[PDB]
Amino acid sequence: YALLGVILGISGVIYAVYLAVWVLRNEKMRFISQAIATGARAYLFRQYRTLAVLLVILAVLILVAIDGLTALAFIVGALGSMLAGYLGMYVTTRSASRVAQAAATGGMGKALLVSWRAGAVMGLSLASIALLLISGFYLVFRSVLPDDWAVPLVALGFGASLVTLFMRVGGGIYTKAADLGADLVGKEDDPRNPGVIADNVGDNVGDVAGMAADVYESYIVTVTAAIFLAAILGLPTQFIEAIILFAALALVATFAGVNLLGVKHPLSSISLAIYATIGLSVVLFFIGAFTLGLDSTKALALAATTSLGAVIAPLIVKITDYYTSYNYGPVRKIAEQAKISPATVIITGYGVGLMSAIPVIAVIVAVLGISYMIGYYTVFGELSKYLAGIFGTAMASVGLLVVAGIIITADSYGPVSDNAGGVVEMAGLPDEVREITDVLDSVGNTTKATTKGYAIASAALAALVLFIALIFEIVYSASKDMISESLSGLQLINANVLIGAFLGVALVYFFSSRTLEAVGRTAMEIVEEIRRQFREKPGILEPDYARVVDIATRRALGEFLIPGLAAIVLPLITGLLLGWNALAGLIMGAIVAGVPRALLMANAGGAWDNAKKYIEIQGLKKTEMHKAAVIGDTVGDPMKDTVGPSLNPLIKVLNTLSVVFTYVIVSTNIALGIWP
Amino acid sequence: YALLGVILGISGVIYAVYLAVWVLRNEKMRFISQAIATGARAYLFRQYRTLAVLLVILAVLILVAIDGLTALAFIVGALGSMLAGYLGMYVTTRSASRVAQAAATGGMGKALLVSWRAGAVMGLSLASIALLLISGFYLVFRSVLPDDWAVPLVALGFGASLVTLFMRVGGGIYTKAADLGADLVGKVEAGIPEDDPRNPGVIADNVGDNVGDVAGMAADVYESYIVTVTAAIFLAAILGLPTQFIEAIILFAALALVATFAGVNLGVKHPLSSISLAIYATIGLSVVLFFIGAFTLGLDSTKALALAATTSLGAVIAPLIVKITDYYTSYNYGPVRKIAEQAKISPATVIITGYGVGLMSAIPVIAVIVAVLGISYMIGYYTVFGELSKYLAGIFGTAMASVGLLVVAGIIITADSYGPVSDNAGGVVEMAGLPDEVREITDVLDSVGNTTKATTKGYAIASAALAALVLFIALIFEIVYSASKDMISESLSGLQLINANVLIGAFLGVALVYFFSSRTLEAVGRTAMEIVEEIRRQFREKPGILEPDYARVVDIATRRALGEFLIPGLAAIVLPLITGLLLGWNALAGLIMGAIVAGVPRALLMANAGGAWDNAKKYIEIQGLKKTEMHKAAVIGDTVGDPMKDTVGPSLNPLIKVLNTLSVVFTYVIVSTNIALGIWP
Ligand SMILES: [Mg+2]
Ligand SMILES: [Mg+2]
Ligand SMILES: [Mg+2]
Ligand SMILES: [Mg+2]
Ligand SMILES: [Mg+2]
Ligand SMILES: [Mg+2]
Ligand SMILES: [Mg+2]
Ligand SMILES: [Mg+2]
Ligand SMILES: [Mg+2]
Ligand SMILES: [Mg+2]
């Protein structure tokens, strides 16, 4: 069913129009909702503009680097994600006023389903775009250039990661640089300062756009890495045709996931995502045995491996939901610490962030470990079996992210409720209706953390699969064998490998701490900019929002190239100056440190944010107790949405440039495996 | 010259009495100095009491586990460090009042040398105790039981690490649980500056100061001096190199004791004198080591200089970390003012950016420890049975480097007692309302000490990073000995980084450290709350205006802190054991990998930021010197990085280091449970 990948995929626009026309179904509410669009307009118009500049130049560079041709698949790969991004962005800006007007007089359900449908637009679209764009080029290359046709479409992944890197560090900086600069100049969502629109425009850039594009990396890298695996091993094409079927059902499981046909409490979100998976699993178990014929133990192995990747997601949902929701303790543990002081709640609110990372880690290892076994016992040398093992882990990581559609649907429901939460406080809407937007926002805050777990954890499984894929790229370049030398050259105790593991964990500090000082300083350029305008005339009686948008992006994107390119070079220099061993260690320590830390922060930031919401509804005042809880908010605030989610686009892309330069780096090493 | 290692060592305690009697050379000033002693008394009396309980029980267990005998060296090994601790404890309690009275009327020099002399007591003694304690049992075991006599004396390291674990997690908790409980009750209920006499937390804090950096840190570094000499000597023995190397290293260490005996001698102006002496206390050691090294031992000119070059790389890195942390930690330098100025905005903004300058302060240390062992790896590889026989000459070149780095520990611990002793004086002056100017100079000695304690965390942790790979190779030969009753062919191809259990372990190793630190953070944060409540019950009874009570606050904090200690302490012992047996030795090899990969960068990330927030407070606390919205922000950052500075940062290092020390003890016990050479179940 290779051709079928396009059939159901193109229905994304078919179904995105349904939800788009669903959202398209006040004076002050319209201007602010329209302001989010104009702000997001100048953002994307300027973000895609410079984005295409570097894409075409590098697409021209990749065209000569491949010389068949691959820059063509390189280009559309990036265009696919951005297309689903522009589709979901125009929805979020309009939802801010839609869900606000719907919730106030309709009830809690009206808000939950409206803000949820606005998110189903992006989730189902992007997932649809990913499947059809690879299945389209997969079938084209399948018949076009035999003998490793899957590799050409794999460059579609690299070009698509370059753009997710763009908005994660760019949108991540902008999302928090505005949230930070707007919050403290007020000391929230007060109309006096223009930072309220720059923040909410950031909300759609941090979690709606920046995060949704990030997970696009998960859906594209594993399908290209998993297909690339089954090819390089020499296994039958039965494996490659089954994975495309599992993916299509995930689109079917996410097409059904978003129906949500009586809403009561915000638990409805977790239940649907929970059963949107089982509906996929058993439908996958059953459709898997239908299209392909394999020995019963081997065919279920595919259904069992992907079932392990799909199940882990609801588990991370229930975990982060526990450590993040104010309904549950670990949030009240720190919110109560507000009575003492901010420093004391900081350290202990930091603490419960650490212990919130180990449960996710405990699952991702046990989950891929079981998939490794089942895939190893079911499906030329001792490695040929071991490779069947790491492939069992590839199937797991693939199964995890193929259901990405349902999770991104939630990363747009959270911020859209954040937008609604802003619309009500600045427009001074009724107390009750402006409070429910906050709980929808606090539930959304539990969602963004859940997706960061879903995003980062899925990356951890791919790294070891990308490791093996990187090897076959250094084996191919070595011949122009290596298996006998690299195996005994990359044992963890080798000189380059251990140093790299320290430079990989040291590089991530230099990358994240460079981002933190940048976002913190560019925000100061927003804080300074506000004074420039507010000093001229009084903010009582009101371009101005477009100014804060354009100034913050070009200053944020300006810094982006510094760490973004610095994170590109330092691995390259170590990869060539020391060797591929050094980068293998650099990518090891990075994946080993990045996955736990980003969880430590992704969860803690959400906890401090939800901790404020819990006391901001009870306290709901400027009390020395609440003032302390706000300090914890803005600390974990940018570290939550800027550096936390950036380790994932670093780790995954960190193996994505090394594999493209294995031919370029191995020839520079002038040796098979070196420690000098 | 193996016997000489003991001769000069015992002269350290002989010489330590000179400075101890030198420091021993007012009414309100006398009671507080004696109160620190009674507090340190009830602390050590209760710490050594339970410390001997588990030591004897396990010493009896180790006696049957070895069945020659090795529990004897197990006992004295731990006793050596504690002896240098009790010598420095009685010194620090007396220095609080001594240095205060000396600085006020003599000048800045009088204070700088007195608080420094009080530290030379601990530094020179402990380093002396370490050298004589190993050369003593080394020479005894060299002639007692040939054929792997070095292994029995290696058990001296584990037993000594078990207790350094005691005070790092225990003293670390106590130091910040008291520092925390005393600080916040002054701002929330009392409304007074820290180190104020009204609340009993002022004595509990300063008593903690001597336990966090003076005792907890100095005892921790004893782990560095003991583990590498046993691991490096164990390497040269197991590697098959000539005994010429084993006799030379004992001389280099003695030279370091001579280079540190001269280091403490110390015209005075700015606290830069500390960095200059510690910088030149190394070169004086290096060239003196270069010179005495060629005299006693004969080796090929290129091969003999290799020893002087390898250890010279371990010795030079320390002053480099000193100048690095001194830059990121001292208010004299930028990165501190970067955040102190952010106090004008808000605490959250200075928190995030004060956190930032902590991260980039970790990459310079990492950049050096890798370059240093890499060059030693090369020089040791090209100078000194299979492809491994040459490669092992490399990691041993790294062992010599790690050995060379920590043999100069004496000069650094001398500084870990100068920092808090100035903190003690800093407290003595503000509560006794001593002259403004002289109580301000104690603060600069306190802020300079803050520049010292962070430097030692770098010095402590970095030396551990080089030893880890040495401990990896040493643990391998312990599983090779148990496997035969070959492994080279199986483990090499069984522990390549992509193995199933190894990668899982690397995630469980970095995950376990979170479970250990966040369990420690919640404990110290909650047990401190047991101190805050304790103050109220006593302060509620009678007014704190007009003053047993100090002995209670000491006794209550220890039994509650030590009570929690067993939870992470034993949990950190088990979880590696479970992974080592449930999954295999591959899993623990990965668990110890991810731990060293996260611990070395993490502990630096925190040790430096915590020190920066404290020094950031100091710069604005003298200019502002008031309760200003600007100063309040710098205090919030202080107490955040405050416990993360002295509890989690310095406890990760004794976790990783002890993790390779317990796993090597179970190589015989864990490999038989795995029921396979290398498996990924
Ligand atoms: Mg906010
Ligand atoms: Mg927001
Ligand atoms: Mg908001
Ligand atoms: Mg929020
Ligand atoms: Mg926020
Ligand atoms: Mg303090
Ligand atoms: Mg202190
Ligand atoms: Mg103090
Ligand atoms: Mg201090
Ligand atoms: Mg302190």
Residue numbers in the entry:
A (entry chain A): 6 to 30, 35 to 76, 83 to 202, 209 to 282, 286 to 403, 408 to 508, 516 to 577, 582 to 715
B (entry chain B): 6 to 30, 35 to 76, 83 to 281, 286 to 403, 408 to 508, 516 to 577, 582 to 715
Please quote the authors directly:
To address them, we solved the first structure of a K+-independent M-PPase (from the thermophile Pyrobaculum aerophilum, PaPPase), performed enzymatic assays on native PaPPase and three variants (A12.46K and A12.49T, and the double mutant), and conducted both electrometric and time-resolved crystallographic studies on TmPPase, a K+-dependent Na+-PPase. The PaPPase structure is in the Mg5IDP-bound state with loop closed and a structural water located at the ion gate. In our new structure, the E5.71-R13.62-R/I/Kˈ10.33 interaction is lost: the cytoplasmic regions of helices 13–14 are straightened, resembling resting state and product-bound structures despite having IDP bound. Helix 5 is straighter than in other M-PPases, which also straightens helices 13–14 (cytoplasmic side) and 2–3 (periplasmic side) by pushing them away from the inner ring. Our PaPPase:Mg5IDP structure provides the first data on the ion gate set-up of K+-independent H+-PPases with E6.53 and shows that the 3D orientation of ion gate residues D6.50, S6.54, N16.46 and E6.53 in particular all resemble the structure of VrPPase:Mg5IDP, a H+-pump with E6.57, and not TmPPase:Mg5IDP, a Na+-pump with E6.53, despite the shift of the semi-conserved glutamate. We modelled SO42− from the crystallisation solution to mediate the inter-subunit communication of Y10.44, Y13.44, and R15.40 in PaPPase:Mg5IDP, but this may be Pi (not present in crystallisation) under physiological conditions. For K12.46, this indeed places ε-NH3+ of K12.46 at the K+-binding site, which would explain K+-independence.
Membrane-bound pyrophosphatases (M-PPases) are homodimeric primary ion pumps that couple the transport of Na+- and/or H+ across membranes to the hydrolysis of pyrophosphate. M-PPases are large (66–89 kDa), single-domain integral membrane proteins comprised of two identical monomers, each with 15–17 transmembrane helices. The helices of each subunit arrange into an inner ring (helices 5, 6, 11, 12, 15, 16) containing the functional core (active site, coupling funnel, ion gate, exit channel) and an outer ring (helices 1–4, 7–10, 13, 14) of largely unknown function. To date, H+-pumping (H+-PPase), Na+-pumping (Na+-PPase) and dual-pumping (Na+,H+-PPase) M-PPases have been found, most of which require potassium (K+) for maximal catalytic activity.
